[PDB]
């Protein structure tokens, strides 16, 4: 019966940790997408500035 109790509690903890990890993974996806776009934009604007300074 104590095992029934602790199995229920670990199932609850299991679901909660699943939710935390799932949202953390979505957050990681959004942060990496922003990282990719920002690195690309840095490369492009440094291309523009090197061309302009070459003049």
Name the residues that contact a copy of itself, by CB under 8 A: 3-4, 6-7, 10-11, 13-14, 17-18, 20-21, 24-25, 27-28, 31-32, 34-35, 38-39, 41-42, 45-46, 48-49, 52-53
18-52 as b/e: b if 16+ CB within 10 A: eeeeeeeeeeeeeeeeeeeeeeeeeeeeeeeeeee
Query: Residue 44 binds which entry of other proteins, a copy of itself, none, with Cβ cut-offs from 5 to 8 Å by kind?
Result: none
Task: Find the radius of gyration of the CA atoms of the chain.
Answer: 24
Contact residues toward other proteins (CB under 8 A) are: 9, 12, 15-16, 19
């Amino acid at each position: 019966e104590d095992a029934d109790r602790k199995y229920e509690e670990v199932a609850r903890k299991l679901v909660i940790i699943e939710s935390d990890l799932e949202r953390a993974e979505e957050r990681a996806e959004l942060s990496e997408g922003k990282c990719a776009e920002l690195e690309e934009e840095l490369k492009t604007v440094t291309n523009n500035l090197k061309s302009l300074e070459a003049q």
